[PDB]
């Protein structure tokens, strides 16, 4: 039911899955996607309520700073436009 996006950029899939597992061990969110951007760039996209998303991304950032090539970015869009849902794949 959550609409807020919590999502992580990582160079390397190791910090990507570590971030995703931090997402699911931090707060009640479901990952809507795992995307291979290219050149080691990988994102994890999770949906949920604003507080749960914020806590999850907090844990993911605190976990992925040093793993592999390292964390690239964390961002917490909380209310995407109705047209942005197709951009995340639905």
């Amino acid at each position: 039911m959550g609409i807020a996006l919590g999502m992580i950029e990582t160079r390397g899939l190791v910090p990507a899955i570590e971030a995703a597992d931090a997402m699911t061990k931090a707060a009640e969110v479901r990952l809507i996607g795992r995307e291979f951007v290219g050149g080691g760039y990988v994102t994890v996209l999770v949906r949920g309520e604003t507080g749960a998303v914020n806590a999850a991304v907090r844990a993911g950032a605190d976990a992925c700073e040093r793993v592999g090539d390292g964390l690239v970015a964390a961002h917490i869009i909380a209310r995407p436009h109705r047209e942005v849902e197709p951009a995340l794949g639905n």
Binding site: A26, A27, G51, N54, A55, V57, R58, A59, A61, D62, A63, E65, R66, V67, L71, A73, A74, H75, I76, I77, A78
Partner: protein
């Protein structure tokens, strides 16, 4: 091996309450790495606290910090509410009896004003003595358009 690794996965979040109580277990304030919560980081928030003073300390300057320190009670700032001018059910004063032992803190849902506290117990309240309301009617005189009612009048 002679090469000591450094720790990680520090899940517990040691934040600090609005009145400096060590709160623990995650935190949803401002992180040095996350993006998107930057807006409104150093803005006053009257009411139920949700952002830590650690966030203010490491993202905002000192005046915001001690303004938050002053602000953000929960429901009971206790007896700081001295004058109600509503016939004052009050604690004794002019009438004896219940006046006995009228100095201890109720430390909860307030009932009596601090002015009655002073007029009964010579000391100021053992709870918040600075008496937020207190002045109430007394301040008056040049209140007129106090605060900022656009000063149209």
């Amino acid at each position: 091996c002679g090469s000591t690794p450094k720790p990680e996965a520090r899940k517990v979040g040691l934040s600090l309450s609005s009145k400096s109580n060590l709160i623990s277990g995650t935190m949803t304030g401002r992180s040095k790495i996350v993006t998107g919560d930057e807006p409104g980081s150093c803005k006053v928030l009257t009411g139920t606290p949700y952002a830590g003073l650690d966030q203010i300390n490491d993202n905002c300057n000192a005046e915001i910090a001690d303004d938050m320190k002053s602000r953000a009670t929960v429901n009971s700032g206790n007896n700081s509410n001295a004058r109600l001018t509503g016939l004052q059910p009050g604690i004794g004063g002019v009438m004896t009896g219940a006046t006995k032992g009228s100095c201890k803190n109720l430390t909860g849902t307030p009932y009596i004003g601090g002015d009655q506290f002073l007029s009964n117990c010579e000391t100021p309240p053992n709870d918040a003595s600075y008496a937020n309301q207190e002045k109430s009617a007394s301040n008056s005189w040049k209140e007129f358009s106090v605060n900022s009612p656009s000063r149209e009048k």
